Amino acid sequence: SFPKYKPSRLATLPATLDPAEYDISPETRKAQAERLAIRSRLKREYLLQYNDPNRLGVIEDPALIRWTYARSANIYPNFRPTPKTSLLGALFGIGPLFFWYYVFKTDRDKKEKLIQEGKLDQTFNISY
């Protein structure tokens, strides 16, 4: 009927346009109940410390600690030299350096051989 909306990476699919939430089976409902239970157990564990009168300080969150550890210290132990890893490393590591070397060396060679010719308009250029 109406023109369709196609999702992408930076503009995802709305929930009401998701065929998965309109095709419900009992296993889906049991999964949703399990998720709610997990959310509930975590919420109670947090609220029992949050409302505690005798508790002074910062409640520590193991999920945050896991996130920072995974983002910093767990990365190298899980690294393998792979065709993808090696090629991406070489590219993003030394490609730009040689690109910029070519650019700057070319520019400065042009300028110097232009100075040797007596042709650059260098009048008034005392400061450098």
Binding site: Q122, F124, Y128
Partner: protein, 175 residues
Amino acid sequence: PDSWDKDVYPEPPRRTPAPAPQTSLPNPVTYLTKIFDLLVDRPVTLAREFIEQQHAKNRYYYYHREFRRVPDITECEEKDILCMFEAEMQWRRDYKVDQEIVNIIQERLKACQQREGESYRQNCAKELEQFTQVSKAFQDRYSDLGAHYSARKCLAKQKQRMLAERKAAKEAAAA
């Protein structure tokens, strides 16, 4: 005033016109000028008069330091460290004086561009030409020396230029 030399910092004779009113209306600028005068310029002048009265009572002076002329780097032999030291200090002082000369010329140029108004492109040509001559000379003497410059590098630059000029004149004489 007379404090600074008007030959180094010159300015034209400062022609200003006479007021030629054309209307019966009062000029608010001149009334404001009288008000400003008698509220600001007179108390300030009196304060300055008292300050200079107190200054005259205790008058003391300072003297510009004069420096002899020692041998330059061309007449120092290759490993004589004392002649080299004095020549390098002299060359550095001369470099500083040349920077200040270029500064004076640039001040003249800027003052002219501001003063001449809409006619600066024609009325400041002599200032521009003077700057061009000074800038060319300063550039030959010190440009491309780099940091870690020295009298020896300035001498090497001069000698390279002199060789090129001599060879050019020699092959022009064969023409």
